[PDB]
Design an enzyme around this catalytic site. Structure first.
Site, short mmCIF file in Angstrom:
data_model
loop_
_atom_site.label_atom_id
_atom_site.label_comp_id
_atom_site.label_asym_id
_atom_site.label_seq_id
_atom_site.Cartn_x
_atom_site.Cartn_y
_atom_site.Cartn_z
N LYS A 1 30.81 -8.16 -8.72
CA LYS A 1 30.43 -7.77 -10.12
C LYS A 1 29.16 -6.87 -9.98
O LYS A 1 28.84 -5.82 -10.22
CB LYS A 1 29.74 -8.74 -10.93
CG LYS A 1 29.39 -8.49 -12.44
CD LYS A 1 29.27 -9.74 -13.31
CE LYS A 1 28.67 -9.41 -14.90
NZ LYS A 1 29.46 -8.38 -15.42
N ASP A 2 28.24 -7.32 -9.00
CA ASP A 2 27.15 -6.57 -8.72
C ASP A 2 27.40 -5.09 -7.77
O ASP A 2 26.56 -4.46 -8.02
CB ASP A 2 26.03 -7.45 -7.44
CG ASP A 2 25.25 -8.58 -8.37
OD1 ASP A 2 25.55 -8.84 -9.61
OD2 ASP A 2 24.67 -9.18 -7.46
N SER B 1 19.41 -19.71 -12.40
CA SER B 1 19.44 -18.69 -13.25
C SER B 1 19.59 -19.13 -14.82
O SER B 1 20.39 -19.87 -15.16
CB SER B 1 20.66 -17.65 -12.90
OG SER B 1 20.29 -17.09 -11.54
C1 HEM Z 1 11.09 -4.90 -7.56
C2 HEM Z 1 11.03 -5.64 -8.73
C3 HEM Z 1 12.18 -6.83 -9.01
C4 HEM Z 1 13.10 -7.23 -8.23
C5 HEM Z 1 13.66 -6.88 -6.90
C6 HEM Z 1 13.77 -8.33 -8.88
C7 HEM Z 1 14.87 -9.08 -8.88
C8 HEM Z 1 15.73 -9.93 -9.21
C9 HEM Z 1 17.01 -10.75 -8.96
C10 HEM Z 1 17.77 -10.18 -7.90
C11 HEM Z 1 17.06 -11.72 -10.11
C12 HEM Z 1 18.18 -12.57 -9.94
C13 HEM Z 1 18.92 -12.49 -11.52
C14 HEM Z 1 19.31 -11.18 -12.01
O1 HEM Z 1 19.50 -10.28 -11.16
O2 HEM Z 1 19.20 -10.95 -13.05
C15 HEM Z 1 15.61 -11.64 -10.74
C16 HEM Z 1 15.60 -12.45 -11.96
C17 HEM Z 1 14.30 -12.52 -12.65
N1 HEM Z 1 13.31 -11.68 -12.59
FE1 HEM Z 1 13.06 -10.42 -11.26
N2 HEM Z 1 12.98 -8.58 -10.12
C18 HEM Z 1 12.18 -7.55 -10.29
C19 HEM Z 1 11.19 -7.56 -11.36
C20 HEM Z 1 10.84 -8.53 -12.11
C21 HEM Z 1 10.09 -8.31 -13.27
C22 HEM Z 1 9.40 -6.83 -13.49
C23 HEM Z 1 9.97 -9.30 -13.96
C24 HEM Z 1 9.20 -9.67 -15.34
C25 HEM Z 1 8.22 -9.06 -15.82
C26 HEM Z 1 11.02 -10.18 -13.40
C27 HEM Z 1 11.32 -11.61 -13.92
C28 HEM Z 1 12.53 -12.10 -13.57
C29 HEM Z 1 13.20 -13.10 -14.54
C30 HEM Z 1 12.45 -13.76 -15.46
C31 HEM Z 1 14.39 -13.45 -14.01
C32 HEM Z 1 15.17 -14.35 -14.35
C33 HEM Z 1 16.58 -14.07 -14.58
C34 HEM Z 1 17.66 -15.03 -15.22
O3 HEM Z 1 17.14 -15.81 -15.95
O4 HEM Z 1 18.80 -15.04 -14.78
N3 HEM Z 1 11.58 -9.55 -12.22
N4 HEM Z 1 15.05 -10.90 -10.55
#
Ligand code: HEM
Ligand code: HEC
Ligand code: HEM
Ligand code: HEM
Ligand code: HEM
Lengths: 50, 47, 78, 379, 66, 51, 238, 99, 59, 109, 54
Positions: D227-228, D205
Site C-alpha cells: 500500500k505504501d 496506530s
Molecule cells: C518529517 C515529519 C514526519 C514524519 C517523517 C512522520 C512520520 C509518521 C509515520 C510514518 C507515521 C505512521 C502512521 C502513518 O504513516 O500515518 C506517523 C504517525 C503520526 N504522526 Fe507523524 N510524521 C511527521 C510529521 C508529523 C507531524 C507534523 C505531526 C503532528 C502535527 C505528526 C503526528 C503524527 C500522528 C498523530 C500520528 C498518528 C497516526 C495514527 O494515528 O495512525 N507527525 N508519522
C-alpha cells in the site's frame, strides 16, 4: 561553570558579527559628487541609504 | 458444534478457472500463478 | 505489543480465501461505482459547503479589488 | 535455531518497526501520508546532497552556482527541480498528515503529537533557510522580512536579529549560516522521526473509526508495505509531473533575478506553504502581536489535545465536528490566498476575519460543538 | 513589407469589444483634453481597448507568422 | 483542575514554595551571569569592576 | 494599473511540444545583431549553441567573430583574442554603472533568465516588444522614457528596438516586427530553459512508464489485499 | 422535540450504519478500560464482535444493509452503569486525596 | 492443454532464480524497446522542430 | 506507579545505555578511550558546524575563507585549531581503541 | 570522483559535501556499534566473564 561559560560565549560570539563586517559600520560619502536634486543612494550597513 | 458451521460460499470472488467444484485446482494452478507472477514480473521490469 | 497478547477475543470465526484462487478486481465497476456514489452523497453534504463559501469569497474579493483599482469618475469630475 | 529476523538485534528492531508491526486493517489512504513524508525526507536528503556537490555558498557565486547546476551539470536541472518541488510535496503531505491527525483524533497520542509539532517547526525552518540559498531577489527579501520579524521581540530584539544575520543586514554571513543550518537540520529531523515512530509504536496506530483495533490487527509486511509503495508511486507521479511538465509552477518568477539589496521586488511573498502564517501575521497590525500570532498558529496544535471535549476520538461519527473541520480547512485555503494577495482594502478585512475564524474554530467552536454532540448522544 | 501584426490589429477594431472600448477611450480622451488642468488620464481606458485587442490578436497572429 | 484545588494540595504548595523561590533565584543568577547582563551586574559589588 | 499579456499560441506551449530550432536560430541572430549592444547573456555560452541552433563549425565561427579579453600574458597585460566555444556571450557594458550611464540610468537586464524572471514569460516579452504605443492624453513621459502599456509603469527606458527589416534572417524569412519578436522570444525561452526539449522527452517517458506501472502495482496491491477484502467473519457464541 | 434532534444526530452519526452501538464508539481512556474489563463476558464478546465487524466494514469502505442498522430505541447503553461506577469511585479517590 | 501463463510459470517463474533472470533479461530488452518507442513518439509529435530533423540543412 | 527512568521509552533506552548498564568493575583507563572518541565526534561536529558557517567551497574563496575564519571571525582561530587538532586526537583515540581491542581480545565481539 | 580530468573546483565542492554528511553516518554506525556491544556486554582486562562483578 566558568569553563562552560567561556566556551559557549566564544562560540556564540563566533556567530556574532566579524571584525571585517564591523569595519564597514561607518561610511564616508562624497557630498561634492552628489548632484543637486538627485538622491544618490549607497549601501550603508549592507542596507540602502538615501 | 464444529459440524454445524459450514464454509460460506466465495464463488463471486473465486477465479473462473477454479469456480467449478468438480475440477481439481492443480490443473489451473500453473495458469493462475503464472497470471499473478506475470503481473509482478512486468512491475519489476518497469521498476 | 507483540502479536500474541494484543487483546482477548472469544468465539470469532474468520474464513479467508487465498489471493491466487480469487480475482484481484471482483466487480470493480459493477459494485465500485454504486459504492462511490453512496460515499460521495454522504460526504458532499459536509465537505463541500465550507469550500463553496471560499469560492464566493474568492470571487467577491477579486471583483472588489478590481473595482477599487478602477478610476472614480467623480474624483476627476469638476 | 531461531529466526534471524526475530533474533538478530538490528533485524529485530527493523522487524518490530516495519515488518511484523501490528497495524489496524482499516486505516485508509490518509495514513499513507506518513510513509510519504518519510520518502519525501529521504528524497530531499539525497537531492540536496547532490545539489551541494555543485553549490557554493558565497554571495558572489551562489546564484552562478545554481545556474551552473541547472545548465552545465549533467541532469542537474532534474535534481534542482526535484528538490524545489519536493519541498512543496513535503509540505503538502505534512499539511494532510496534520489534518488527518486532527480529523481522526490521533492527537491523543500526546508524545507523538508533540514530537510532530517539533518536527513541523524544524521542517519549516529548514525550508525557510533553504529558500534563501539560491540568493535570488525573492530569497534575499523574504529572508529580510522574516528575520526582521524577530525585531518585534522586546528587549533582546535587535541583538537577536543581528546575531542571526551575522551583521547589520542579510549578507554573505547569513547566506553561509543558512546553508550550514539547512544542511544539518534534515538529519535532526531524521532522528526526531525515529523518536516519533518509537512513541507511536508504544501506542499502536489509530484507525479512522477511532476505536481500539487490537481485536482486528494485520501484519504490516504483507499489506501496508505494498500500500505504501503504491502511495509512493502516486506521489512520484505528482512530483515528477511538477518537476518535468511544469517545473516553475509553484515558484515565484522573481527568484531568477540575482538579489539586489538596493531594489525591492514588485511583490514580497513567502513560499506557498508559509503563506497562511504570513497572512495571519499581516492581519495583526502590531509587530509583536503579529509575531505572537504567527507562533500561536502552529503552537495551537499543542493545545489541541487539551481542547478535545468529545467522548469519541474520531470525527467519523461527529457530523457537526466534520463541518467545523472542513470550515477550518477552507479557512486555511483562504489564508493562503490572502497571503498571496497584497495588503489592500478588500484583502485586509478578509485576512483579519480569516485569522479570527481560524483561532475561534480551533479554540471555542470545536469544543463547544463537541459538548453539544455529547449532549445529543445522551451522554 | 506588410507586418502581419498591423493587419491582424485592424481586425480587432471591427470586433464589438474593440468598438465599445475605442469609443470609451475617445470620449475620455476628449474630456481630459477639454479640461485645462485635470489629473485624469486615458491609461485605464486605453488598457481596456488594448486588452480586448491583444486577446483577439493573440488567437490569430501566430497563424500568419511563420 | 478542581481536583488540585484542595487544602492538602495547598499544604504541598506551601511546602515546596521556598524551594521554588530558591530555584528561581538560581535561575536569575545563572541568567545574569551567563549573559553578563550589565543592567543587573552594575549594582553588584566587585563584579562592577568589569565593563 | 497593469495590463496582463495575452496567451499567444506558442509552438512550445504543448504539453509534449518543444521549441522550433529554426526559430531559435533566427532568434539568436536577432539577439546578436539587435539586443546585444544592450543586455548581456552572461549565463549562455557559444558551446550551448552547438547542439541547438548552429553546428560546431558554425558555433566556432560565430565565437571567433567577436573578440574576447584573455588572461594576463607575460608582462601581465590583458590582450584580446579571437574567441572560442568556451567563452560565454560578451557583455556589451563593462560594469553595471557604465551600462546605466549609457542608457539614461536604466540597467539593461540580463536576457539569460529574462523569460523565467518576468511574469508572463515569453508572452510578456513579446507583448512589450510589439506593444510600444503612443502615450495617452495626460501622460508626460520624461525624455528618455517611452510608452509601453505592458512594462510596469508604462515608462520603459528603451526605444522600440524591433522595427520591420531591422535585420535580415539568413533563412530568408521576411523580417517583420512580429516575426522578429517571435523569433527572439523563442530564443529567450530556450535560453531560460535549455533543458526544455529533454524535459518534455522525459515527461513523455515518465507518463508512459507510470501508466504502465500504476495499474500493475495496483493489481499487485489488490491481489495481496484480496485475502482481507474477501474475508468473511462469523460470530458463534456457545 | 429534543428527541427529534437527538434521533437526527443518531442517524447523522454513522455508528448505527456500521452496526455499532453508542457505547462501542466511546474513547477508551483509563475509566473506559476499567469499565470494559468489568463487563460481563456476554456483553464483552458482543462488544468485540461488533467492533471487529465494524472495522471490517470500514476496511472495504462498505456499510451494513439498511435492515441491519441499529435502531435509536433498540440501542442499549451497556457500558453506562459500569463506567458511571468507575467514574464515581475515581471521584471518591480524588476527593479523599484533596483533603 | 497448458495455457501460456501455465507454461511460463513452470518454465521461468517457479524458481526465483529463473524468475529474477527473466526480470533482468526482460529489463534489458524493455529499456531498448521503450526508449526507442518513446523517442519515435516524441520525434513524431515534434517533427520538423528539432535539430536532428533540421541538422541536414546546415551541415 | 513506575519510575520514569525505567518506564518512559526514550528514558528507558537512555537508562539501559548509560545509567543502569551492567559494567565490569575492573575495566581500566583503556576503556575510557571509547567515550573519548564519542566526545571527540560530538566536538568535531559542533566545531565543524561553526566552521562551515564561514567556509565557502569554491576554489577562488576556499583559502581566503579559511584566512577569514582565522583572522576575522570572533574566536575563529579557536574553532579552527580545535577542529584541526581534534582530528589528530580523534585518530589517537581510534588507534588506542583498536590496540585495546587487539590486546584484550575484544575482537571476539 | 574527481568530477573532471584532475582535482579542481568540482572535487573541492564534492569533498565539502561528503565531509559534511559522513560524520552523521559515523554517529549512526556508532549507535549500531554500542547496540551490538550492549548485546554482549563489555570485556574486562582479565578476559574472563565478569557477570559476578558487574
Ligand atoms: C518529517 C515529519 C514526519 C514524519 C517523517 C512522520 C512520520 C509518521 C509515520 C510514518 C507515521 C505512521 C502512521 C502513518 O504513516 O500515518 C506517523 C504517525 C503520526 N504522526 Fe507523524 N510524521 C511527521 C510529521 C508529523 C507531524 C507534523 C505531526 C503532528 C502535527 C505528526 C503526528 C503524527 C500522528 C498523530 C500520528 C498518528 C497516526 C495514527 O494515528 O495512525 N507527525 N508519522
Ligand atoms: C539598447 C540600450 C537597448 C535595445 C536595442 C533593447 N533594449 Fe531592452 N532595455 C534596455 C534598457 C536600458 C531597459 C531599461 C528599461 C527598464 O527600466 O525597464 C530595457 C528594458 C527591457 C525589458 C524590461 C526590463 C524589466 O522591466 O525587467 C525587457 C524584457 C527587455 N528590455 C528586452 C529587450 C528585447 C527582447 C529587445 C529586442 C528584441 C530589447 N530589449 C531592445 C536596453 C535595450
Ligand atoms: C529534508 C528536507 C529539505 C527541504 C524541505 C529542503 C528545502 C529546500 C528548498 C525549498 C530549497 C530552495 C530550492 C530553490 O528555490 O531553488 C533548497 C535548496 C537547497 N537544499 Fe535543500 N531541503 C532539504 C534537505 C536538504 C539537504 C539534506 C541538503 C544537503 C546538502 C540540502 C541542500 C540544499 C542545497 C545545496 C540547496 C541549494 C541548491 C538549490 O537551491 O537548488 N537540502 N532546499
Ligand atoms: C569514531 C570511532 C569510534 C567510536 C565513536 C567508538 C565507540 C565505542 C564506544 C563508546 C565503546 C564503549 C566504550 C569502550 O569499550 O571503551 C566502544 C567499544 C569498542 N569498540 Fe569502538 N568506537 C570507535 C572506533 C572503533 C574501531 C575503529 C574499532 C575496531 C577496529 C572499534 C571496536 C570496538 C570494540 C571491539 C569495542 C569493545 C571494547 C570492549 O568491549 O572492551 N571501535 N567503541
Ligand atoms: C570526525 C569528524 C571530523 C574529522 C576527523 C575532520 C577532519 C578535518 C581535518 C583534518 C581538517 C583539516 C583542518 C586544517 O587543515 O586546518 C578539517 C577541516 C574542516 N572540516 Fe572537518 N572533520 C570532521 C568533521 C567535520 C564536520 C562535521 C564538519 C562540518 C559540519 C567539518 C567541516 C570542516 C571545515 C569547514 C573545515 C575547514 C577548516 C580549515 O580550513 O582549517 N568537519 N576537518
Amino acid at each position: 561553570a566558568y569553563a562552560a561559560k567561556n566556551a559557549v560565549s566564544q562560540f556564540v560570539s563566533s556567530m556574532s558579527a566579524s571584525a571585517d563586517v564591523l569595519a564597514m559600520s561607518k561610511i564616508e560619502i562624497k557630498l561634492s559628487d552628489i548632484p543637486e536634486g538627485k538622491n544618490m543612494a549607497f549601501k550603508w550597513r549592507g542596507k540602502p541609504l538615501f | 458444534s464444529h459440524t454445524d458451521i459450514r464454509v460460506p460460499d466465495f464463488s463471486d470472488y473465486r477465479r473462473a478457472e477454479v469456480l467449478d467444484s468438480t475440477k481439481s485446482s492443480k490443473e489451473s494452478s500453473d495458469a493462475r500463478k503464472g497470471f499473478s507472477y506475470l503481473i509482478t514480473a512486468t512491475t519489476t521490469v518497469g521498476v | 505489543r507483540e502479536f500474541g497478547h494484543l487483546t482477548r477475543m472469544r468465539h470469532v470465526i474468520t474464513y479467508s480465501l487465498s489471493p491466487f484462487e480469487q480475482r484481484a478486481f471482483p466487480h470493480y465497476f459493477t459494485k465500485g461505482i454504486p459504492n462511490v456514489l453512496r460515499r460521495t452523497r454522504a460526504c458532499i453534504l459536509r465537505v463541500a459547503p465550507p469550500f463553496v463559501v471560499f469560492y464566493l469569497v474568492y470571487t467577491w474579493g477579486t471583483q472588489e479589488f478590481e473595482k477599487s483599482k478602477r478610476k472614480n469618475p467623480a474624483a476627476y469630475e469638476n | 535455531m531461531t529466526n534471524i529476523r526475530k533474533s538478530h538485534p538490528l533485524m529485530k528492531i527493523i522487524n518490530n518497526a516495519f515488518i511484523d508491526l501490528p497495524a489496524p486493517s482499516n486505516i485508509s489512504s490518509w495514513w499513507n501520508f506518513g510513509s510519504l513524508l518519510g520518502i519525501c525526507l529521504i528524497l530531499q536528503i539525497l537531492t540536496g546532497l547532490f545539489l551541494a556537490m555543485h553549490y557554493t555558498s558565497d554571495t558572489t557565486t551562489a546564484f552562478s552556482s545554481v545556474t551552473h547546476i541547472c545548465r552545465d551539470v549533467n541532469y542537474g536541472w532534474v535534481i534542482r527541480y526535484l528538490h524545489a518541488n519536493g519541498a512543496s510535496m513535503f509540505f503538502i503531505c505534512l499539511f494532510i498528515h496534520v489534518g488527518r491527525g486532527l480529523y481522526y483524533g490521533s492527537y491523543m497520542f500526546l508524545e507523538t503529537w508533540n514530537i510532530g509539532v517539533v518536527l513541523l517547526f524544524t521542517v519549516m525552518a529548514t525550508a525557510f533557510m533553504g529558500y534563501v540559498l539560491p540568493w535570488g531577489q525573492m530569497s534575499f527579501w523574504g529572508a529580510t522580512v522574516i528575520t526582521n520579524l524577530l525585531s518585534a521581540i522586546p528587549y533582546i530584539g535587535t541583538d537577536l536579529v543581528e546575531w542571526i544575520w551575522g551583521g547589520f543586514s542579510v549578507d554573505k554571513a547569513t547566506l553561509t549560516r543558512f546553508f550550514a543550518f539547512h544542511f544539518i537540520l534534515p538529519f535532526i529531523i531524521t532522528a526526531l522521526a525515529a523518536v516519533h515512530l518509537l512513541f507511536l509504536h508504544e501506542t499502536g496506530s489509530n484507525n479512522p473509526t477511532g476505536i481500539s483495533s487490537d481485536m482486528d490487527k494485520i501484519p504490516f509486511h504483507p499489506y501496508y508495505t505494498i500500500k505504501d509503495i503504491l502511495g509512493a508511486l502516486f506521489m512520484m507521479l505528482i512530483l515528477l509531473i511538477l518537476v518535468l511538465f511544469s517545473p516553475d509552477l509553484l515558484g515565484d518568477p522573481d527568484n531568477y533575478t540575482p538579489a539586489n539589496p538596493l531594489n525591492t521586488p514588485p511583490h514580497i511573498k513567502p513560499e506557498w506553504y508559509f503563506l497562511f502564517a504570513y497572512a495571519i501575521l499581516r492581519s495583526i497590525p502590531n509587530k509583536l502581536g503579529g509575531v505572537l500570532a504567527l507562533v500561536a498558529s502552529i503552537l495551537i496544535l499543542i493545545l489541541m489535545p487539551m481542547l478535545h471535549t468529545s467522548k469519541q476520538r474520531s470525527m467519523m461519527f461527529r457530523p457537526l465536528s466534520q463541518c467545523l473541520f472542513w470550515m477550518l480547512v477552507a479557512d486555511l485555503i483562504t489564508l493562503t490566498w490572502i497571503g498571496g494577495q497584497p495588503v489592500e482594502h478588500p484583502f485586509i478585512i478578509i485576512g483579519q476575519l480569516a485569522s479570527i475564524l481560524y483561532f475561534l474554530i480551533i479554540l471555542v467552536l470545536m469544543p463547544i460543538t463537541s459538548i453539544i454532540e455529547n449532549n445529543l448522544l445522551k451522554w | 513589407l506588410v507586418d502581419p501584426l498591423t493587419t491582424v490589429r485592424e481586425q480587432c477594431e471591427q470586433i464589438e469589444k474593440c468598438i465599445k472600448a475605442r469609443e470609451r477611450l475617445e470620449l475620455c480622451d476628449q474630456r481630459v483634453s477639454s479640461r485645462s488642468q485635470t489629473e485624469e488620464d486615458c491609461t485605464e481606458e486605453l488598457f481596456d481597448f488594448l486588452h480586448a485587442r491583444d486577446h483577439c490578436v493573440a488567437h490569430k497572429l501566430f497563424n500568419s507568422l511563420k | 483542575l478542581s481536583r488540585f484545588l484542595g487544602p492538602r494540595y495547598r499544604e504541598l504548595a506551601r511546602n515546596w514554595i521556598p524551594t521554588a523561590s530558591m530555584w528561581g533565584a538560581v535561575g536569575a543568577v545563572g541568567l545574569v551571569w551567563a549573559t553578563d547582563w550589565r543592567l543587573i551586574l552594575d549594582w553588584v559589588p566587585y563584579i562592577n569592576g568589569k565593563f | 494599473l497593469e495590463l496582463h499579456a495575452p496567451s499567444y499560441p506558442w509552438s512550445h506551449r504543448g504539453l509534449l511540444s518543444s521549441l522550433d530550432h529554426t526559430s531559435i536560430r533566427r532568434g539568436f541572430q536577432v539577439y546578436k545583431q539587435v539586443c546585444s549592444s544592450c543586455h548581456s547573456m552572461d549565463y549562455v555560452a557559444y558551446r550551448h549553441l552547438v547542439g541547438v541552433c548552429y553546428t560546431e563549425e558554425e558555433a566556432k565561427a560565430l565565437a571567433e567573430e567577436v573578440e574576447v579579453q584573455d588572461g594576463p600574458n607575460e608582462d601581465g597585460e590583458m590582450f584580446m583574442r579571437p574567441g572560442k566555444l568556451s567563452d560565454y556571450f560578451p557583455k556589451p557594458y563593462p560594469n553595471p554603472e557604465a551600462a546605466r550611464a549609457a542608457n539614461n540610468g536604466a540597467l539593461p537586464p540580463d536576457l539569460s533568465y529574462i523569460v523565467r524572471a518576468r511574469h508572463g514569460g515569453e508572452d510578456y516579452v513579446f507583448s512589450l516588444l510589439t506593444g510600444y504605443c503612443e502615450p495617452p492624453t495626460g501622460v508626460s513621459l520624461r525624455e528618455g522614457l517611452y510608452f509601453n502599456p505592458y512594462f510596469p509603469g508604462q515608462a520603459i527606458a528603451m526605444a522600440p528596438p524591433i522595427y520591420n527589416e531591422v535585420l535580415e534572417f539568413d533563412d530568408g524569412t521576411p523580417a517583420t516586427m512580429s516575426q522578429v519578436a517571435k523569433d527572439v522570444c523563442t530564443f529567450l525561452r530556450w535560453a531560460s530553459e535549455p533543458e526544455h526539449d529533454h524535459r518534455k522527452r522525459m515527461g513523455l517517458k515518465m507518463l508512459m512508464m507510470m501508466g504502465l506501472l500504476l495499474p500493475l502495482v495496483y493489481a499487485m496491491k489488490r491481489h495481496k489485499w484480496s485475502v482481507l477484502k474477501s474475508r468473511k467473519l462469523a460470530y458463534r457464541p456457545p | 422535540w429534543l428527541e427529534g434532534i437527538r434521533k437526527w444526530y443518531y442517524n447523522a452519526a454513522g455508528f448505527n450504519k456500521l452496526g455499532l452501538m453508542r457505547d462501542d464508539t466511546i474513547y477508551e481512556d483509563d475509566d473506559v478500560k476499567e469499565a470494559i474489563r468489568r463487563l460481563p463476558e456476554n456483553l464483552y464478546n458482543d462488544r468485540v464482535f461488533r467492533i471487529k465487524r465494524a472495522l471490517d466494514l470500514t476496511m472495504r469502505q462498505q456499510i451494513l444493509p439498511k435492515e441491519q442498522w441499529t435502531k435509536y430505541e433498540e440501542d442499549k447503553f451497556y457500558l453506562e452503569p459500569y463506567l458511571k461506577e468507575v467514574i464515581r469511585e475515581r471521584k471518591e479517590r480524588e476527593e479523599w486525596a484533596k483533603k | 492443454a497448458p495455457t501460456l501463463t501455465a507454461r511460463l510459470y513452470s518454465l521461468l517463474f517457479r524458481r526465483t532464480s529463473t524468475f529474477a533472470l527473466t526480470i533482468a533479461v526482460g529489463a534489458l530488452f524493455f529499456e531498448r524497446a521503450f526508449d526507442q518507442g518513446a523517442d519515435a513518439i516524441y520525434e513524431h509529435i515534434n517533427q520538423g522542430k528539432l535539430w536532428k530533423h533540421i541538422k541536414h540543412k546546415y551541415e
